[PDB]
Design a protein around this nucleic acid. Structure first.
Ligand SMILES: [Mg+2]
Lengths: 134, 1212
DNA sequence: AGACAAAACGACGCGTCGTTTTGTCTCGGCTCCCCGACATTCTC
């Protein structure tokens, strides 16, 4: 029993080809219907528009399809800002990462998956970060 | 001509502040500001501090802390017992399996509750000591009582058996833990009293009462005789309750000097007085002549239904347990070789004190018995040193530079008064203070018998040999007698005469076998230091024997001389030892005086004085007084004043006067204020809040500039403590530095009295503005009671006056039922000039003309006072009908606390005991989390339980208040049946049925009401209740404890709104507030489960505006045009529960009539607070109220454009 | 006529506004520091 959350990295490695192993492990990780934040989808849209220069229509179609079928969005907790400031005193991370962990934690998530953000490090003794591609 | 006036009225929890800008000469002026600050606490404290009953939350916190600390010390004792016994291989395998000995030293493994004897195998519990159980059954069979007894009764059989037989090691470990449970009463000081110490609880019978011929108060007093031949020391009047009455007394007998017992008496009641119970149980144990364990075992043998814990043995001297445990250990010692193996003993010593090799070296010389008894179980820590709290000398200082590069001053602790230095000082001071008078002419007969130095020499030598003198001895020293002379002191009073040295002389005289010169200054001061420092019996006798060895005296009578020295009283002088030692030479005269013993600085100052030259450290008043000090020899017999100045150069304490220049000085003074520096917390809170309020008004109205307050008027209206302290503190701001204003208080500080304020309020029509303001409340009560007794018409004024019926006039005052009476008082005080207070305090003139000018200047022609300005009264109306009352709040839920603890740290290759700070985070809860009573959850098939609620059952005493409805609320059905039968049998009268006699009768005849079936007796029953109770904790058995929220802990009330518009309410209890604030979040969730956005949170003492039924307040703001209809619709939260919030109009202090369940009437119904408005619309406040925010001065605070700029101007 | 939409029935049944009433940890021993007030003497 555990609540799995994920970050922009898993979706980005899922989409790209040149990293066949990373893309694979990402697509199996998407099979367990892992929960997502609204933030993570927002940076997904941003990186698709900046890095991948995809047109708006296709991007919105893909995000709607994934939110409907593969990934399960989670509500934007209203205490995200105070709690993100709480981890700011004890943790050394980029503020966007602090928000994604804040919203994952406030939604009862136990395990988060990504390359970055200090593999294997438990956050406020209630959430863990696991690099799954290794 | 224009003067700024700050008037302050000080109450128990109220500060009334007013600031006005007056021209008395031109008959003008206007009020700038008014307000009242209220510190909420219940009227219980108000009625309690007048008499005094633990009126401090600090004391309650201290009590909880002490109880906890005792608990952890018991735990630590048991913990060390586990460690030692595990080393000894004494704990059983099944038990010791579930104790951690590696990380948590000796603690039970988490989520386990092992018992030493109850072994669990495949989910079943079995006893471990079967053979001892069978032996105890055989003993009971020999006694012939039963054959079915509890297994856990074996402990007393073993404790008796341990005295003279061999028991297995497991029972010994069990017995040791039991002894750790029950330690016993013990006094740390001890000091075994008179050898007889009779103190014997006896039961005596009064034989006869012979009328003693002592006719007092129209009645002749009788004496009392007893069967043993004893007479009651006191007499008796009431014959009926003394004839042949089996009375039990506590008596003390002392062998008097005549050689007879001086017997005392004291009536005492068993089972109701702790001393009587203790003595009776102690005597029952001794008269049995056996250990208390065997006494308990025998009493359980004879009466197997006996309650031991709390009934049979409650409290007995620690000596009993000590002797029993000693006998047990010694008699088990010769059988168990494990108690002699010194290898194991060293192993235990190393385990228990690995970081203290000194203590190991100490206890390596002892054995197991001393380690178990004196070290682990019966180890009582000594009292903490209060020496660091001793006061400081006002003259001697010391300066030093720390690691921070600053120069800060240490302090010199004051001299103990028992020190012979201070003794000689007080004797010299008195000797200079003494002067004789004659009885005949009451003339100053001095300068004849004590004029030359030799007379004072003989006087001092005489006074050294005694300890305290009287009229007689001081007169007879000079040969004078009672009939002709008096000594200028209280004729029948005794004054200290160096008790220390004289009593030392007596004890050194009784020892004998010594030369009559061994008592000198060095020896006396030494033995004083020994007898002052070591206040502990064994240490004290060691020290005395060592002194008798080092100094060539026999240690056979000297220790007997000094073993029963009564310890010194705890008192200290005003000065320190250095200051007294420096001062002593100058008060000296004759042979005890010499110039050589005066230090360099004072000798230099003496040379400067005699030479007549000019120094900056010497004032003109000095030579004015020291004109007679021409020669250095004149520095003989100098008193305290002159010598003190010459030593330290200051004309005693002349104070610093002081002058604050801005609000920064005040705020620094407030920052540096120390807790517990005054009489009691109430006045301290009042003074601190007054200082905060005056700082705020200074900032708001004068912006912290110099001398913005032209004058401050102060008044109070027990509480007199703050009458002078606040005036002294606030004198700094309104003082004048020109030299005209010199004294303890600034001349601008003008306290008044009740006479002035009441005469003014009558003469100004202020009473009229007040009663006009309050009348609507009385009209509301009239319409509520449907009468006309709450308002009285008058024709002299032609209007309705507030009034109360006589039956509701128990303690009424019209003035105490509002909060802005404080503002009224402040305003009337402010306008009262020094002329007014002088006129009304010194009305006695001795001549009409002299005070007639004040009459013409102040009285209307002496009828009424003339207006400060023509618009005074209506302006006062406008001001007072426009006051917001500001209520201080205490929403402390969590705060940070720092923990220091002793521990051995490795530094520079050495283990040193130093103080470590706790790692990690740890919060302190600042509110009582829940109520003390603990209930347990039950499930009853015959009770229907609503969803979301549970049934909790608690034990209660079966007593007179158990009627049929309540009898139906006991969880036990058979008990319900039996109690129903009994209550029916007593005609349905619980008072007769459930009296203690009735309970006894039911217990004796339980067959008659159980349908003939046997049943155990009943004294307490578990009554169940249906409601919402939450678990105390989650660990161990704390998940089975169900409690209720504590008083005053429903502190936040959330109001949310959904998208359409309805308001939803929630009462958020303290628990989730705690973990929310611990997670850094807001106190209340910002959305509810439905997702409705949170409007806001309400707390007790909050303020809301309740708009009219027609107004639509959605984005109103505009809180600057607060007129009277706006301000009358301001409600303060009072309490909260569920979805209900109760409010009181902010201007209400006390309800005219509270609520009584008989008449069923009240100002605000039963709760004394309404969920709705008091006005005729009666609208739910919670559905339309809007939260507001006020400051200390009660001014509304709202978003503005400057504020919206500054929000992120600060971050820019 | 068919088959969906929902009103109607049931005893049953539990929730709900408004107020009132009820229940709420207790006693023992000391020790030692500080302060306050009120009396006397003494210096200024
Ligand atoms: Mg990131």
């Amino acid at each position: 029993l555990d609540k799995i959350a994920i970050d922009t990295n898993i979706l980005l490695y899922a989409y790209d080809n040149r990293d066949l192993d990373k893309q694979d492990r990402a697509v199996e990780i998407l099979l367990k219907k892992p929960f997502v934040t609204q933030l993570v989808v927002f940076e997904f849209i941003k990186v698709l528009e900046r890095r991948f220069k995809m047109d708006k229509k296709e991007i919105t179609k893909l995000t709607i399809k994934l939110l409907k079928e593969v990934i399960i969005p989670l509500s934007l907790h209203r205490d995200i800002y105070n709690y993100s400031q709480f981890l700011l005193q004890r943790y050394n991370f980029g503020l966007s990462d602090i928000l994604v962990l804040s919203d994952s934690i406030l939604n009862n998530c136990t395990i988060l998956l990504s390359e970055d953000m200090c593999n294997g490090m438990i956050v406020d003794k209630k959430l863990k970060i696991v690099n799954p591609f290794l | 001509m224009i003067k700024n006036i700050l008037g302050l009225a000080l109450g128990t929890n109220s500060i009334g502040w007013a600031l006005v800008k007056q021209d008395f000469e031109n008959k003008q002026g206007e009020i700038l500001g008014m307000g009242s600050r209220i510190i909420p606490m219940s009227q219980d404290i108000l009625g309690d501090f007048g008499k005094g009953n633990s009126v401090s939350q600090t004391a309650e916190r201290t009590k909880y802390r002490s109880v906890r600390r005792l608990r952890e010390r018991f735990l630590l004792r048991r913990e060390r017992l586990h460690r030692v016994l595990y080393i000894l291989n004494f704990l059983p395998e099944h038990y010791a399996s579930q104790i951690d000995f590696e990380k948590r030293l000796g603690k039970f493994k988490v989520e386990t509750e092992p018992k030493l004897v109850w072994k669990n195998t495949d989910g079943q519990f079995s006893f471990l000591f079967q053979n001892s159980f069978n032996e105890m059954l055989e003993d009971f069979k020999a006694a012939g009582q039963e054959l079915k007894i509890p297994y856990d009764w074996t402990i007393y059989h073993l404790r008796k058996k341990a005295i003279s037989q061999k028991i297995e090691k497991e029972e010994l470990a069990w017995i040791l833990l039991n002894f750790n449970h029950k330690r016993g009463y013990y006094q740390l000081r001890g000091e075994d009293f008179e050898e007889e110490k009779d103190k014997t609880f006896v039961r005596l019978k009064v034989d006869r009462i012979v009328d003693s011929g002592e006719n007092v108060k129209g009645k002749i007093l009788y004496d009392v005789y007893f069967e043993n031949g004893w007479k009651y020391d006191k007499q008796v009047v009431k014959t009926e309750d003394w004839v042949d009455r089996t009375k039990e007394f506590i008596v003390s007998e002392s062998i008097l000097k005549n050689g007879e017992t001086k017997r005392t008496f004291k009536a005492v009641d068993s089972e109701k007085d702790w001393i009587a119970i203790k003595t009776k149980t102690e005597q029952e144990i001794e008269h049995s002549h056996k250990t208390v364990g065997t006494y308990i075992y025998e009493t359980l043998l004879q009466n197997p239904k006996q309650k031991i814990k709390g009934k049979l043995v409650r409290t007995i001297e620690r000596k009993f347990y000590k002797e029993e445990l000693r006998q047990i250990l010694e008699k088990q010692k010769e059988f168990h070789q494990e108690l002699q193996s010194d290898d194991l003993y060293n192993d235990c010593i190393r385990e228990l004190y690995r970081n203290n090799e000194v203590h190991q070296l100490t206890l390596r010389k002892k054995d197991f018995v001393h380690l178990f008894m004196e070290d682990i179980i019966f180890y009582q820590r000594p009292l903490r040193s209060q020496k660091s709290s001793v006061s400081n000398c006002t003259l001697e200082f010391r300066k030093y530079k720390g690691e921070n590069g600053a120069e800060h001053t240490q302090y010199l602790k004051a001299i103990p008064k028992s020190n012979p230095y201070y003794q000689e000082f007080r004797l010299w001071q008195w000797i200079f203070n003494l002067n004789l008078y004659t009885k005949d002419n009451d003339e100053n007969v001095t300068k004849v018998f004590l004029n030359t130095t030799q007379d004072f020499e003989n006087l001092f030598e005489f006074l050294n040999t005694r300890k305290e003198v009287d009229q007689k001895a001081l007169l007879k020293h000079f040969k004078l007698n009672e009939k002709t002379h008096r000594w200028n002191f209280v004729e029948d009073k005794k004054y200290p005469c160096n008790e220390t040295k004289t009593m030392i002389s007596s004890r050194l005289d009784k020892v004998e076998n010594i030369s009559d010169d061994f008592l000198t200054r060095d020896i006396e001061q030494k033995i004083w230091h020994i007898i002052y420092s070591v206040n502990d019996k064994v240490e004290y006798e060691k020290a005395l024997k060592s002194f008798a060895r080092k100094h060539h005296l026999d240690e056979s009578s000297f220790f007997e001389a000094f073993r029963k020295f009564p310890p010194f009283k705890s008192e200290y002088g005003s000065f320190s030892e250095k200051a007294i030692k420096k001062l002593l030479p100058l008060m000296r005269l004759g042979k005890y005086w010499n110039y050589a013993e005066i230090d360099k600085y004072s000798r230099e100052r003496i040379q400067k004085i005699i030479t007549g030259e000019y120094d900056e450290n010497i004032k003109d008043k000095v030579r004015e007084k020291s004109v007679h000090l021409t020669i250095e020899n004149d520095f003989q017999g100098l008193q305290l004043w002159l010598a003190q100045y010459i030593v330290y150069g200051r004309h005693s304490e002349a104070s610093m006067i002081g002058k604050w220049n801005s609000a920064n000085d005040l705020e620094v003074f407030l920052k540096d204020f120390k807790q517990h520096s005054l009489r009691n917390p109430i006045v301290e809170q009042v003074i601190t809040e007054t200082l905060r309020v005056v700082k705020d008004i200074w900032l708001k109205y004068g912006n912290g500039t110099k001398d913005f307050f032209n004058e401050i008027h102060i008044e109070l209206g027990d509480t007199r403590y703050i009458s002078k302290y606040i005036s002294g503190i606030l004198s700094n701001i309104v003082r004048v530095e020109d030299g005209s204003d010199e004294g303890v208080n600034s001349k601008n500080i003008v306290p008044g009295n009740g006479k002035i304020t009441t005469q003014l309020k009558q003469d100004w029509g202020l009473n009229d503005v007040w009663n006009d303001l309050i009348l609507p409340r009385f009209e509301r009560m009239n319409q509520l009671t449907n009468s006309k007794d709450f308002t009285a018409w008058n024709e002299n004024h032609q209007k309705f006056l507030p009034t109360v019926p006589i039956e509701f006039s128990k303690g009424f005052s019209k003035k105490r039922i509002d909060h802005r009476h404080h503002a009224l008082d402040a305003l009337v005080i402010a306008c009262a000039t020094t002329d007014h207070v002088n006129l009304l305090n010194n009305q006695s003139a001795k001549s009409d003309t002299k005070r007639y000018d004040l009459k013409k200047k102040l009285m209307k022609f002496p009828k009424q006072f003339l207006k400060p300005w023509e618009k005074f009264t209506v302006d006062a109306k406008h001001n007072l009908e426009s006051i917001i009352v500001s209520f201080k709040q205490n929403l402390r839920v969590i705060n940070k606390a720092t923990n220091y603890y002793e521990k051995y740290v490795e530094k520079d290759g050495t283990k040193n005991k130093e103080r470590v700070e706790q790692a990690g985070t740890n919060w302190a809860i600042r509110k009582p989390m829940h109520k003390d009573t603990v209930s347990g959850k039950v499930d009853l098939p015959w009770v229907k339980v609503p969803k979301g609620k549970i049934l909790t059952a608690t034990r209660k005493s079966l007593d007179s208040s158990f009627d049929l409805k309540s009898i139906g609320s006991i969880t036990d059905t058979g008990i319900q049946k039996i109690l129903k039968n009994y209550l029916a049998f007593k005609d349905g009268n619980p008072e007769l049925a459930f009296s203690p006699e009735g309970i006894d009768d039911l217990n004796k005849n339980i067959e008659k009401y159980n349908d003939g079936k046997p049943h155990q007796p009943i004294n307490k029953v578990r009554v169940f209740e249906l409601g919402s109770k939450f678990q105390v904790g989650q660990t161990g058995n704390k998940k089975g404890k169900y409690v209720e929220a504590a008083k005053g802990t429903n502190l936040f009330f959330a109001v949310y709104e959904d998208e359409k518009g309805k308001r939803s309410y929630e009462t958020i209890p303290l628990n989730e507030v705690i973990e929310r604030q611990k997670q850094g979040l807001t106190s209340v969730p910002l959305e509810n489960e439905k997702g409705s956005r949170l409007l806001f949170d309400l707390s007790p003492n909050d303020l809301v505006y309740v708009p009219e039924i027609d107004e639509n307040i959605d984005s109103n703001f505009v809180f600057s045009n607060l007129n009277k209809e706006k301000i009358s619709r301001i409600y303060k939260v009072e309490k909260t529960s569920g979805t209900e919030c109760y409010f009181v109009r902010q201007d209400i202090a006390y309800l005219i009539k509270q609520y009584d369940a008989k008449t069923k009437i009240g100002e605000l119904e039963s709760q004394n607070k309404l969920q709705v408005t008091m006005t005729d619309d009666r609208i739910r406040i919670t559905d339309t109220c809007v939260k507001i925010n006020c400051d200390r001065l009660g001014n509304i605070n709202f978003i503005t454009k400057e504020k919206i700029k500054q929000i992120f101007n600060e971050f820019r």
